[PDB]
Design a protein around this ligand. Structure first.
Ligand SMILES: [Ca+2]
Lengths: 46, 252, 113
């Protein structure tokens, strides 16, 4: 998961580098009950 | 959240509950973006007509909550506000345009399985994910219907709607700082945010890096979950410039 | 009666002929810095919330509305962020110790140093 930081931790605080990764899910290779519904919605009919 | 479902434990580690001290009651939703910064809607903090004109001491920021009412000791953490920052161009006396506000915590919060910050979108991710049909997720402890509350955090996935269609769904003036989402009646599914959910995040999972990005902030609507109507959210990315200004000047 | 020139917020209790003590209603107590004024009180881990009879509840400082319309003490020590040193939790507040173990400094309700 390559993420590019945008803020400066001195004023933003810590956490940005590991943002968006849920300890109980992404970090444990587990998915929530409706997550796939979101990904399925990226389908682009032509 | 109307027509949603119970969230799973740790499903939204960035969800924040703005709790009023007097009287003791849920005020609005919000989100964690770092260990010291919280994002929410301006009208939650400032909008006198709806009994909203809060100072930093008037409320508590509660992070890592699941239950709406139970003081979840050992899980949730109560942080105190050092300063509230409302967008300078937000004017409640006129509209809910630029409905956004930053809250700096006195002390950094400690992350955990239940407390973790959400990502803010970059140019590419914003243009790429904010497209009609694409579904985002909304969470909050607000009302279950227009007209009564949930025991635990509610969650619902809603599709982004094409601007023109949003513009036609209401007589109310719409700006570029907002976007709308929700199912159309013929789509056969329901769901929407409602009173109490404001300030909460509208998140999307990036198919590029598997991370969750906050694309919007629950802001307003006309009633809740009405056919033909859509919920409106503050366009987080279009205000990212202001977010950076505030964090740079007052970061420390 | 010593209560004539007394500015008791709720009620005045004659002690003798030269003194008195402002008292409060069940659930309240004199404010430390303004003894003539009253406010919700609790020295227990949990106390009934003072909700409206006809229900928007109130809790004393240091407590938080919990299930069953009860004000539960906030444990600032386990919570973190309230104290930077050795923290001992108290009903309605907390004690925070720090500084060199040789010349320890203590605070109540506020961070230390
Ligand atoms: Ca305490």
């Amino acid at each position: 998961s390559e993420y590019q930081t945008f803020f400066n931790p001195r004023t933003f605080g810590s956490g940005e580098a590991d943002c968006g990764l849920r300890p109980l899910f992404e970090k444990k290779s587990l998915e929530d009950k409706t997550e796939r519904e979101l990904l399925e919605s990226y389908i682009d009919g032509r | 959240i109307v027509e949603g479902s119970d969230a799973e434990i740790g499903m939204s580690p960035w969800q924040v509950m703005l709790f009023r001290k007097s009287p003791q009651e849920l005020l609005c939703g919000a989100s964690l973006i770092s260990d010291r910064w919280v994002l929410t809607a301006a009208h939650c903090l400032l909008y006198p007509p709806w009994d909203k004109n809060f100072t930093e001491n008037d409320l508590l920021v509660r992070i890592g909550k699941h239950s709406r009412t139970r003081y979840e000791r050992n899980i949730e953490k109560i942080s105190m506000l050092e300063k509230i920052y409302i967008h300078p161009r937000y004017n409640w006396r006129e509209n809910l345009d630029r409905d956004i506000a930053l809250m700096k915590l006195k002390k950094p919060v400690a992350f955990s399985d239940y407390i973790h910050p959400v990502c803010l979108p970059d140019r590419e991710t914003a243009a790429s994910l904010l497209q009609a049909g694409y579904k985002g997720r909304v969470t909050g402890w607000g009302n279950l219907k227009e007209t009564g509350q949930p025991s635990v955090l509610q969650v619902v996935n809603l599709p982004i709607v094409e601007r023109p269609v949003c513009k036609d769904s209401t007589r109310i003036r719409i700006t570029d700082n907002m976007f709308c989402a929700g199912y159309k009646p013929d789509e056969g599914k329901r769901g929407d945010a409602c009173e109490g959910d404001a300030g909460g995040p509208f998140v999307m999972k990036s198919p590029f890096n598997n991370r969750w990005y906050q694309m919007g902030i629950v802001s307003w609507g006309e009633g809740c979950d009405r056919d033909g109507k859509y919920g409106f959210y503050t366009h987080v990315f279009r205000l990212k410039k202001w977010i950076q200004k505030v964090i740079d000047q007052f970061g420390e | 009666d010593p209560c004539f020139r007394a500015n008791c917020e709720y009620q005045c209790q004659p002690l003798n002929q030269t003194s008195y003590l402002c008292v409060c209603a069940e659930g309240f107590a004199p404010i430390p810095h303004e003894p003539h004024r009253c406010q919700l009180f609790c020295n227990q881990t949990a106390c009934p919330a003072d909700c409206d009879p006809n229900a928007s509840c109130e809790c004393p400082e240091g407590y938080i509305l919990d299930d069953g319309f009860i004000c539960t003490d906030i444990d600032e020590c386990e919570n973190g962020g309230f104290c930077s040193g050795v923290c001992h939790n108290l009903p309605g507040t907390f004690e925070c110790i720090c500084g060199p173990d040789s010349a320890l400094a203590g605070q109540i309700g506020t961070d230390c140093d």
